[PDB]
Amino acid sequence: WLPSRSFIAAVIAIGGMQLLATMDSTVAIVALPKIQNELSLSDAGRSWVITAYVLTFGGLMLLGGRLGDTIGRKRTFIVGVALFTISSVLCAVAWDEATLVIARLSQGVGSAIASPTGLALVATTFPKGPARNAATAVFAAMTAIGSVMGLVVGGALTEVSWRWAFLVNVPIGLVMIYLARTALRETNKERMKLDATGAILATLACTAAVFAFSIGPEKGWMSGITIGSGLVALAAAVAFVIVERTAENPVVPFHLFRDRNRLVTFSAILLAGGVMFSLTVCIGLYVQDILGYSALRAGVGFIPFVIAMGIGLGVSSQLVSRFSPRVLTIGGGYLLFGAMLYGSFFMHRGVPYFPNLVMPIVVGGIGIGMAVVPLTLSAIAGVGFDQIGPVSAIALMLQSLGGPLVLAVIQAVITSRTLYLGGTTGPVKFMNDVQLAALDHAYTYGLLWVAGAAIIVGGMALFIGYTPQQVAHAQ
Amino acid sequence: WLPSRSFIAAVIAIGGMQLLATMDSTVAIVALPKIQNELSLSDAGRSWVITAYVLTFGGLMLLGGRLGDTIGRKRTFIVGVALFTISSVLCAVAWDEATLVIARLSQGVGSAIASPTGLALVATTFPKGPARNAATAVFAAMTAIGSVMGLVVGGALTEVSWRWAFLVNVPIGLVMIYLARTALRETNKERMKLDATGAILATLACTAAVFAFSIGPEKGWMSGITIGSGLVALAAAVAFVIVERTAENPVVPFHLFRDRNRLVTFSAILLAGGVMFSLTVCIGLYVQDILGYSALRAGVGFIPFVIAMGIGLGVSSQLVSRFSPRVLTIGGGYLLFGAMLYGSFFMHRGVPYFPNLVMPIVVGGIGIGMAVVPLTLSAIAGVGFDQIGPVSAIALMLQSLGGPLVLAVIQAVITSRTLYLGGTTGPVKFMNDVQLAALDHAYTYGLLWVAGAAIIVGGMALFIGYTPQQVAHAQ
Ligand SMILES: CC(C)C[C@H]1[C@H](C(=O)Nc2ccc(-c3ncccn3)c(Br)n2)C1(C)C
Ligand SMILES: CC(C)C[C@H]1[C@H](C(=O)Nc2ccc(-c3ncccn3)c(Br)n2)C1(C)C
């Protein structure tokens, strides 16, 4: 009850990077159409606005994870958050496509440098035990807070110009840099050297893969650029693996994958993050399009999701010290699966808010809050303080990567269903009631597919062999 | 509230055959070891005692289903229940192996004649609507009552000789024959002729298959007798299909399998009955062996399962008129899956009764009661009064057949796990604590496998395309 001010300031400062990044991404998604109208942007720019940020977020994140070790996690976290804030400032004063794309690239650089270092700071500054559980709970809770409050900000500031939308990154960034300065404690001066070749190879492979995946649907899936970027990514990845095989300071430790339970945990993290991201996108689109709710209305409706995830994460953090991560993950998935089944069976257009919408979202949020803590706790387990960087970077990369990878499948299933039912393809303004009902049924079918994916997730999580002793009991 | 006396008497009389058959089977399983000691029986006879009954129950049941149409469902039900009662009387005075085997064969004949006719009487005397829902609820509820009360009777009468155990079949049989005589109403005299060749071919195929499966584990799996019986069963089945292709009065209507939703429903019935039977066997063995509970204690502990299934079946019968059978089946399976997960995660040797044993069983019973009614309602749907016999017979055959077929897999998994953990094979008296713990863990693993099977069941049940209009809304 009422912990130390230093502890709460430290956890807030550490989770601040995920909070800020998710909130900024949500605001960008919400305010994307306004940028196109005001700046007179084409669909290519509509892609590029998010493409640059995701490109530099996925490309340099392993570089950031190792750079945290080579310079110091606190100091590189400060650098990353400051760079993100400055890039947001530059974006807020953008006047053409080039400067905004450069600002998005700089934001991606800042996020890639800072967020894996954020996970490493969760796992490093606080020793194993109740402190780590509380840090993880705050991490996930304020990530959800950032997402939903960014949706709220985007909905509220849609009347004013989009320039003001990106400025909320500034006060939050400054205050959380101040919190990291004053609160977080610096360790000894065990300066450690970085291996340039492995880092640059990993960066090249990741950036080529992200560029290929982003340019796929726009430029064509078998065009020259997409296949060239894909083959470049594959060659860079295989060269990176070959170099890491003999690296004295591995960028990614292939040594630490000896434990098969760790491989199971990482794959479960990937697929669970994918399911969660697909759920986010599908719920946002379904609420904003079918039910006709504004973005501000969507945010104030998802605030109960934030509350429910708060209770779920608190309960999971309390219960990890007694129950196995397998058990808690399965229970959270059970609650989330019940919520998804209820959503896919008893909700169509015109349903009320309190009966049919608050309860499934609250139950799903409680389940997700129960499931997140054990998974990421098992991710950061059995590692030295000199090995935490790459492990956290890989876990965060899997969590962020699984999202779009299965979201593409879910979108394909939904569009196939809505064309099977006879729904018109395009913006929801043109379609009349019949195509709207077809889209609603397609969204329910996509939710059923997401539920099947969650079934798979639990199937893999049933093999998580860790015991709570080596997770949340310190010495 | 307080329906007509004729209606309640009719539903009790119709479900009486399943009640009596299940109760007698449970009593026979409980009292099997006492028969071996008193009569000086070998392991071959230990097999034969149940083998004869299951042989004649699975062999002649389709013959009974069509014989219900060719003579009259009420009158053949009377004949079947009377034959079962007389066979139980003859078994109660058995003095050697031959007469007891003959009595078991006669009991199997009676069950095969009467129980599919029982399902046909559920689906025929009461027209579609609330009456059919109530009849189905009573059917399933008193089937569970028969099973659990037979376990109670076997546990209570284990001190006295096994002769008295089989005599409870007599008063119940007589009173339910009286109920069927006085209450159930006979239809017109639309006497209809039976096709002998198809019926005899189906009987031969079924009896050969049951004999092969029963003689498999005892005599060897690749012995001459088992492979010969298997090939005879296959030849009889293919000849039966060829004859049914051109049968003027098909024993099994291949015409009615046009609807793919019906095929999905029948396969779901098969696998759900298999899961339920495996659950019954595993729970009985785990309670009687690991926890060291007597059969009477097991029955008084499973009485709450009867209560919970009663509430579940009542709620499902009420809700079928509003929700689709798919929805109710999925919800009942969700509750049952939660119960199985809780049982497989937080129960080992030495757990108390009220906290760790009553609640999972009650939740599973409520889920099963919710799931049974829609499935069997979808089974008896879209059929004429001249086609109900074979459909009910096929549904009951699938429900009874799925049980041992997946129970063998579950037993193999459990024994493999307990030998992997180092547990000794054999009766639980010889093994010490370490093998007992290994057996407990193996039982939990088998429960996990049953949970996976239930996941499969829900996967198939998600394709059940019926709407409640054509299930429980009469005209
Ligand atoms: C056989 C089986 C055990 C299936 C299993 C299904 C399930 O839901 N698994 C599951 C667990 C956790 C998560 C999750 N992880 C991180 C964040 C949010 N949620 C997710 Br998406 N799915 C069931 C039925 C419980
Ligand atoms: C994807 C999926 C929808 C999986 C589904 C699992 C399930 O449990 N399906 C299910 C339904 C009914 C029955 C049943 N039928 C008759 C009598 C008793 N029970 C059984 Br065994 N299993 C879940 C998670 C709900």
PDB file of C-alpha atoms in Angstrom, chain A residues 323 326-327 330 334-335 337-338 341 345-346 448 455 462, chain B residues 323 326-327 330 334-335 337-338 341 345-346 448 455 462:
ATOM      1  CA  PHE A 323       0.588 -20.441  -9.424  1.00  0.00           C
ATOM      2  CA  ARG A 326       1.153 -22.038 -17.478  1.00  0.00           C
ATOM      3  CA  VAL A 327      -1.898 -22.013 -15.201  1.00  0.00           C
ATOM      4  CA  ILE A 330      -4.420 -20.707 -19.530  1.00  0.00           C
ATOM      5  CA  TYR A 334     -10.006 -19.016 -20.996  1.00  0.00           C
ATOM      6  CA  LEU A 335     -11.594 -15.736 -19.921  1.00  0.00           C
ATOM      7  CA  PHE A 337     -11.896 -16.957 -25.212  1.00  0.00           C
ATOM      8  CA  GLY A 338     -15.238 -16.770 -23.434  1.00  0.00           C
ATOM      9  CA  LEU A 341     -17.169 -16.309 -28.174  1.00  0.00           C
ATOM     10  CA  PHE A 345     -22.348 -14.939 -31.049  1.00  0.00           C
ATOM     11  CA  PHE A 346     -24.522 -12.138 -29.595  1.00  0.00           C
ATOM     12  CA  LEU A 448     -14.193 -16.714 -34.727  1.00  0.00           C
ATOM     13  CA  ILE A 455      -7.003 -21.840 -29.041  1.00  0.00           C
ATOM     14  CA  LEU A 462       0.382 -25.672 -22.287  1.00  0.00           C
TER      15      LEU A 462
ATOM     16  CA  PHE B 323     -30.879 -19.642 -29.045  1.00  0.00           C
ATOM     17  CA  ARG B 326     -24.732 -24.222 -32.041  1.00  0.00           C
ATOM     18  CA  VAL B 327     -24.674 -21.485 -29.395  1.00  0.00           C
ATOM     19  CA  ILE B 330     -20.652 -24.156 -27.526  1.00  0.00           C
ATOM     20  CA  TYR B 334     -17.131 -23.922 -22.650  1.00  0.00           C
ATOM     21  CA  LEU B 335     -18.336 -24.619 -19.115  1.00  0.00           C
ATOM     22  CA  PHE B 337     -13.851 -27.247 -20.712  1.00  0.00           C
ATOM     23  CA  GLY B 338     -13.333 -24.824 -17.843  1.00  0.00           C
ATOM     24  CA  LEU B 341      -9.007 -27.480 -17.041  1.00  0.00           C
ATOM     25  CA  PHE B 345      -4.567 -28.145 -12.939  1.00  0.00           C
ATOM     26  CA  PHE B 346      -5.524 -28.052  -9.228  1.00  0.00           C
ATOM     27  CA  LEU B 448      -5.779 -32.790 -20.694  1.00  0.00           C
ATOM     28  CA  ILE B 455     -11.870 -28.717 -28.219  1.00  0.00           C
ATOM     29  CA  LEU B 462     -19.361 -24.826 -34.821  1.00  0.00           C
TER      30      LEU B 462
END
